[PDB]
């Protein structure tokens, strides 16, 4: 059955960016999907997106801009000490210069740079580059 709505969203995004499309329908929507997408927007990996109220779970239509190599979940959402973000970034990201590991912290969903600054940690969620 459908287990990670976030996994399905990011999978759809990956498949479309590979085929050179400039837009994707996602379904369901969720708070966490939306929060994730906003982190992607803020660093300019996507364009606009548009939640479509259907009186159910919702649909999103993202606009893609070619800049995205790979988004992806991590599953399960491992707990991450502040110490051990450095290991997750070493494993997941192409370089030390760019790309973001994305965490749920009690402070909020956010990239790992923000989490360094704010001095917070929590659960790993996914990654983008």
């Amino acid at each position: 059955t459908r287990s990670s709505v976030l996994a399905d969203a990011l999978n759809a995004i990956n498949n479309a960016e590979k085929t050179g499309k400039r837009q994707v329908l996602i379904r369901p929507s969720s708070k966490v999907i939306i929060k994730f997408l906003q982190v992607m927007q803020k660093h300019g990996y996507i364009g606009e997106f548009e939640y479509i109220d259907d009186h159910r779970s919702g649909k999103i239509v993202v606009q893609l801009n070619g800049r995205l190599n790979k988004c992806g979940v991590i599953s399960p959402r491992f707990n991450v000490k502040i110490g051990d973000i450095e290991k997750w970034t070493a494993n997941l990201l192409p370089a030390r210069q760019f790309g973001y590991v994305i965490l749920t912290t009690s402070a909020g969903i956010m990239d790992h740079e923000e989490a360094r600054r704010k001095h917070v940690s929590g659960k790993i969620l996914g990654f983008v580059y």
């Binding site: 085929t19 499309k21 837009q23 329908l25 548009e50 479509i52």
Partner: protein, 81 residues
């Protein structure tokens, strides 16, 4: 097609699509104001009927049910309300 408007599909294509596969799902069934010959008392009848709908006063058949959309009786007058 690489670049497409998913938010604004054409009404032609959105009619072709199945009732769940449209941008927002909704029913393509409708209601009818059916009128029998004998009595003029009007009845709301649903297009995909299932029940053999009898009028309360008259007591005659208005529509027999089928797979999908109910076949009405021969002598009737109908309109989408």
């Amino acid at each position: 097609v690489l670049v497409q408007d998913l938010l604004h599909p054409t009404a032609a294509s959105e009619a072709r699509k199945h009732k769940l596969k449209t941008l927002v799902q909704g029913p393509r069934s409708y209601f009818l104001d059916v009128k029998c010959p004998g009595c003029l008392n009007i009845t709301t009848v649903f297009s995909h009927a299932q029940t053999a709908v009898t009028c309360e006063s008259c007591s005659t058949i208005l529509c027999t049910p089928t797979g999908g959309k109910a076949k009405l009786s021969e002598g009737t007058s109908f309109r989408r309300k």
